[PDB]
């Protein structure tokens, strides 16, 4: 988990609530006694909108993107066009608290100390309906049919679109635990409703006017996030039933909030940060920490950006980066899903299995029959129960309840290998350390290169450019090579005779390991793999291309974005920004590159992975005319042409 400050500003005053245009282009902020309009790209403040007299305690903005509502200590509410003019003023019983537009009908609500004021667009009247208590925070059900209200009295209550009250829940303790914000989860069919508009014009008006004066709930699917000043968060159904248990805190929370996706939660407060959570209320990380109390944390529409507002008047705009976590071995891509699950995919059979953790997943590693997963406070070892190469029945083998610091992680037959920042540790399953190795420079890359169970070779690349082989049953590290620049990435060919290296200047270099000599290099690479079966052939990605190279011949280049994770038979396991894509090789092309050189015996090895009967016949008659009768015999047996077999 990583978060980057994209831009920052500070108002003259405290910042009370936040609104986004639905396309994400403009941000509106209820700062002190004016509205502020911001560009989300770089934080330029376009205009202070002037209409109110006193503290703008909130703003909210309708799903069609034409109109926004803002509420004040001066008792006013104002409806602003997206032309930034306030066409319909209104004046409530007391100071405004929170306001919220309906997802479906554009019906507005506007909360106050006793009274909440519903109206649907440009009707001539408002339902100023009464409440038992100070009405702190309000949120519409995802289908638009109920407005749920949280009270300073520690009650949440649920009102229909007409204003009748249908359900109540009390937090045990009542006014001990004020409800300072609540939010219905966005995760239902209606989120794409209003996601299709291309209207090119807007409404316009001379001067600003005034506006005068439910069964089978257990089958309704919606879920409500409750943040209370008893310092607990919990989730609730429209039936009033609590989901699971209270996710405890050590702060006064505010503005419990979700991304457009409904799967990740933002949580601000008197912890003076924006904490990030799963939809189950498990913690996942920390968006930027703050000088003062956080009142507001609003996720941007359609995207992973976040914006925050604090008691000191700071506005901060963050991008969340959500890095990729995975490992492949030969043909089993294991990767992070949500941030709590591993999905393990058998790439030949296309089977998937889900393993669910109960925390963040930080590191994954995989090897024949062994999977390993690191969480914040334990490391899990998983085992395939059968020697069958098609098996997917992972069981937890062992669970090491110990915390670790690491740069890289790998797993072998009987061991976990931990890279600390200049040091390599071998740990048994069951956590007892076996051996350790100290490098002459910072470790940049590691791969397991196979071996007998318990003597496995590790291949290691250092920042000084040294490359090492280390045997897990040995106390000494074996120099393979040294290079003029750091190892960015590293792989060995199918026989273990050859090495490919990425040099941290975006080039691929290729070496003989048995003689320690450079064979060739390529000027644009970011990740590289040897073909797992067909030696003398490799693939890399870089600069928006995929690049397949055979045996010192020219390289096949085609457009791709994403990275090579592995290469088997006729398929390259390229990884797109969220999922594995399995590109296929033009086997016919490298086969002709061997026939260019009359290497008939080598050309058959590219053909034999899968080519057309045209390719087989062309190979067969080139071998026949080359007087390579042992190749031609086999190249024609594939076509089964008895005429030339008789010859």
């Amino acid at each position: 988990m990583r978060a980057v400050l994209t831009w920052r500003d500070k108002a003259e005053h405290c910042i009370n609530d936040i609104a986004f245009k639905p396309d994400g282009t403009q941000l509106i902020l209820a700062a002190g006694s004016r509205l502020l309009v911001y560009d989300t790209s770089d934080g330029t403040l376009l205009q202070p909108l002037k209409g109110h007299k006193d503290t703008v305690y909130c703003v909210a903005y309708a799903k069609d993107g034409k109109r926004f509502a803002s509420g004040s200590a001066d008792k006013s509410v104002i409806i602003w066009t997206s032309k930034l003019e306030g066409i319909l003023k209104y004046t409530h019983n007391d100071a405004i608290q929170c306001v919220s537009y309906n997802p479906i009908t554009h019906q507005l609500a506007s909360c106050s100390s006793s009274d909440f004021g519903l109206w649907s667009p440009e009707q001539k009247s408002v339902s100023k309906h009464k409440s038992s208590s100070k009405i702190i925070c309000c949120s519409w059900t995802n289908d638009g049919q109920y407005l749920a209200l949280g009270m300073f009295n520690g009650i949440i209550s649920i009102r229909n679109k007409n204003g009748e009250e249908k359900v109540k829940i009390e937090r045990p303790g009542g006014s001990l635990s004020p409800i300072w914000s609540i939010c219905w989860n966005p995760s239902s069919r209606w989120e794409s409703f209003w996601m299709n508009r291309e209207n090119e014009d807007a409404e316009d008006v001379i001067v600003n006017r005034y506006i005068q004066e439910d069964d089978n709930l257990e089958e309704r699917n919606d879920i409500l996030a409750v943040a209370d000043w008893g310092q607990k968060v919990s989730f609730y159904q429209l039936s009033g039933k609590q989901i699971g248990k209270d996710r405890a805190l050590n702060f006064d929370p505010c503005c419990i909030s979700y991304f457009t996706k409904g799967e990740y939660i933002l949580l601000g407060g008197s912890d003076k940060q924006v904490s990030l959570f799963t939809k189950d209320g498990v913690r996942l990380g920390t968006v930027g920490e703050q000088n003062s109390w956080v009142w507001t944390c609003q996720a941007k529409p359609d995207s992973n950006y976040v914006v925050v507002g604090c008691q000191d008047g700071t506005i901060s705009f963050y991008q969340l980066i959500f890095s990729t976590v995975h490992g492949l071995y030969k043909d089993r891509y294991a990767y992070r899903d949500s941030m709590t699950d591993v999905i393990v995919q058998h790439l030949i059979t296309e089977q998937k299995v889900r393993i669910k953790c109960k925390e963040l997943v930080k590191k994954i590693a995989i090897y024949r029959n062994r999977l390993a997963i690191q969480l914040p406070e334990k490391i899990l070892i998983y085992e395939l129960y059968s020697e069958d190469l098609s098996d997917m029945h992972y069981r937890v083998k062992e669970k090491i309840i110990k915390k670790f610091e690491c740069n890289l992680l790998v797993v072998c037959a009987n061991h976990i290998i931990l890279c600390q920042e200049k040091r390599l540790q071998c740990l048994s399953f069951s956590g007892v350390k076996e051996r350790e190795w100290q490098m002459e420079s910072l470790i940049r890359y590691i791969k397991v290169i196979g071996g007998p169970p318990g003597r496995e070779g590790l291949l290691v690349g250092l920042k000084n450019g040294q490359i090492l082989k280390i045997f897990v049953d040995n106390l000494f590290a074996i120099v393979l090579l040294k290079q003029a620049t750091a190892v960015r990435c590293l792989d060995m060919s199918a026989s273990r005779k050859k090495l490919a290296v990425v040099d941290e200047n975006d080039t691929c270099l290729v070496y003989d390991i048995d003689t320690k000599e450079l064979l060739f290099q390529e000027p644009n690479a970011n990740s590289v793999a040897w073909n797992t079966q067909c030696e003398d052939m490799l693939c890399f990605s870089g600069g928006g291309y995929l690049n397949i190279k055979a045996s010192t011949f020219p390289v096949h280049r085609q457009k791709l974005q994403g990275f090579v994770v592995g290469y088997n038979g006729s398929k390259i396991f390229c990884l797109h920004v969220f999922s594995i894509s399995a590109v296929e090789v033009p086997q016919s092309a490298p086969m002709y590159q061997y026939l260019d050189r009359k290497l008939f015996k080598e050309a058959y090895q590219i053909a034999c992975l899968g080519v057309t009967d045209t390719d087989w016949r062309e190979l067969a008659m080139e071998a026949l005319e080359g007087l390579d009768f042992e190749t031609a015999k086999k190249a024609f047996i594939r076509v089964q042409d008895l005429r030339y077999l008789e010859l």
Partner: protein, 324 residues
């Protein structure tokens, strides 16, 4: 019967038991043995590669493989060749490079793998000497001299004045710990006998610790003349400041004026420690001379123990080897 691709299959299949039973089936000097030997090298298996380079009658590559996989014992144990002496110079150069990296414990382990047990003992003694002179934890310093003494015994085993006195530093720290144990046990007259026996070990334990502990046990015993001996020995030390000499004199004169500078109760172990009549062996279980005519002796360190006191132990009180 396609051994030449059956090897390629057992390697790609990762069956090193298959590839072993393939290479063990071939004739000597058979054309496939040097490639199966290289497969075992690429995967890190020394005994299988050594077996293959011996069936190929190709012995220089076996030695070089033992060097490459750091099996320096097996590298030098191929005693049929002159190259064994030559690689002893490479082993020395590799150890010198570990010592330029200051990895003295790895150079000790490498010399132990080389069967250079004298040079491993010498380096372990160098650590035991420095760690003694730092005033390190006494039991850690016992362990360090025991590690050296066991390497001197392994060099003596390899034959089948640091060369001739293997256990001396282990005895010194053992009796120095035992005197302090006997003091904490309130057995101060046994602590006194053990601290008197430490007079012999001034080359290993600095005289300050010896004569401080002896003066303390002698004073607690009311042997204030033996305490006076220890104080005279302390004040003589040329490494002390005039301040420290005076502080020891102040304490000696405090004891002498409050009681006496003579023994109110007398130790008699000096009857051996004058050396002319020879010495009885000091028991490693008790720090007192063995008066028994014949008695138990440790098969490892060859120190004696009283036949009653040895019954209290599973492991030798000096060397921690099992009793026998």
């Amino acid at each position: 019967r396609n051994q030449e691709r059956l090897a390629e299959c057992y390697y790609m299949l990762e069956d090193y038991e298959g590839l072993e039973n393939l290479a063990i089936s071939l004739p000597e000097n058979h054309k496939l043995l040097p490639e199966i030997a290289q497969m075992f090298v690429r995967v890190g298996m020394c005994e299988q590669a050594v077996t293959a380079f011996l069936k190929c009658s190709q012995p220089k590559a076996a030695v070089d493989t033992c060097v490459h996989l750091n099996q320096w014992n097996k590298a030098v144990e191929l005693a049929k060749n002159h190259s064994m002496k030559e690689i002893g110079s490479l082993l020395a150069r590799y150890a010198s490079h570990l010592l330029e990296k200051n990895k003295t414990l790895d150079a000790i382990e490498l010399y132990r793998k080389a069967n250079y047990f004298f040079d491993a003992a010498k380096l372990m003694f160098k650590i035991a000497d420095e760690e003694a002179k730092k005033g390190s934890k006494p039991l850690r310093v016992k362990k360090l001299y025991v590690l050296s003494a066991l390497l001197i015994e392994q060099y003596h085993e390899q034959m089948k004045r640091f060369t001739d006195n293997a256990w001396r530093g282990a005895e010194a720290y053992h009796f120095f710990i035992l005197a302090q144990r006997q003091l904490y046990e309130g057995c101060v007259d046994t602590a006194l006998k053990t601290a008197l026996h430490l007079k012999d070990y001034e080359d290993i334990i600095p005289p300050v610790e010896i004569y401080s502990l002896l003066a303390l046990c002698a004073c607690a015993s009311r042997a204030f003349g033996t305490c006076s001996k220890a104080f005279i020995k302390l004040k003589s030390l040329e490494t002390l400041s005039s301040e420290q000499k005076q502080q020891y004199e102040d304490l000696a004169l405090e004891i002498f004026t409050k009681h006496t500078s003579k023994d109110n109760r007398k130790p008699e172990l000096d009857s051996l420690m004058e050396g002319g009549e020879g010495k009885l062996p000091t028991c490693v279980a008790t720090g007192s001379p063995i008066t028994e005519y014949q008695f138990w002796m440790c098969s490892v360190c060859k120190h004696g123990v009283l036949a009653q006191e040895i019954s209290h132990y599973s492991f030798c009180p000096l060397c921690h080897s099992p009793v026998g």
